[PDB]
């Protein structure tokens, strides 16, 4: 349907899809909280449907997710003043998103523990532009495509170990990828 950066709301959620124009990468809108996407040699790319704002809503998501090669399933989002872009990681394949940065602790939510991290990001896109902003990690210890994801309590975890969080932009249950190939097929419930 699209292969090029668009948000809109469609059937009553927010979606956000965002590519560099890398290789080749295909989004559609489906019925009511519905998404796939397919591609292939991709650049970056993050993609899904969701609020926009966020609340600190509880997240139910099902569906399949099949990368072949660098891929997160995520809840995915922003806060600004400050900006954040923060990610609560419920799958990713071939490569930690984490690498690279001291664990602050662990979030037990959900019928898993998470892994609690703080990076930076500098002169990188964002829904502010180009910009130097910090991104929050939640990734679950055991991978998993669907369930509940109590929003809430990872935004407290985060929270109590410093990381400060701003005034909520969109929220979203998202695929990202980089210099893979893949589909998925995702509904918000
Ligand atoms: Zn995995
Ligand atoms: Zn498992």
């Known amino acids: 349907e699209i292969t090029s950066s668009e948000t809109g709301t469609n059937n009553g959620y927010y979606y956000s899809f965002w590519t560099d124009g890398g290789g080749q990468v295909t989004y559609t809108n489906g019925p009511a909280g519905q998404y796939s996407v397919e591609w292939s040699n991709s650049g970056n790319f993050v993609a899904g449907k969701g609020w926009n704002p966020g609340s600190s809503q509880t997240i139910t998501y099902s569906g399949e997710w099949n990368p072949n090669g660098n891929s997160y ?22 490569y930690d998103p984490s690498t690279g940065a001291q664990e602050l602790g662990t979030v037990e939510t959900d019928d898993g523990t998470y892994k609690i991290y703080q990076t930076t990001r500098e002169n990188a896109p964002s829904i502010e532009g180009t910009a130097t902003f910090n991104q929050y990690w939640s990734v679950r210890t055991d991978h998993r495509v669907g369930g509940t994801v109590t929003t809430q309590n990872h935004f407290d975890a985060w929270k109590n170990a410093g990381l400060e969080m701003g005034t909520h932009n969109y929220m979203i249950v998202a695929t990202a990828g980089y210099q893979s190939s893949g589909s998925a097929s995702i509904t918000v419930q």
């Open 73 to 94: 399933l995520s809840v995915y989002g922003w806060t600004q003043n400050p900006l954040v872009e923060y990610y609560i990681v419920e799958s990713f394949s071939t």
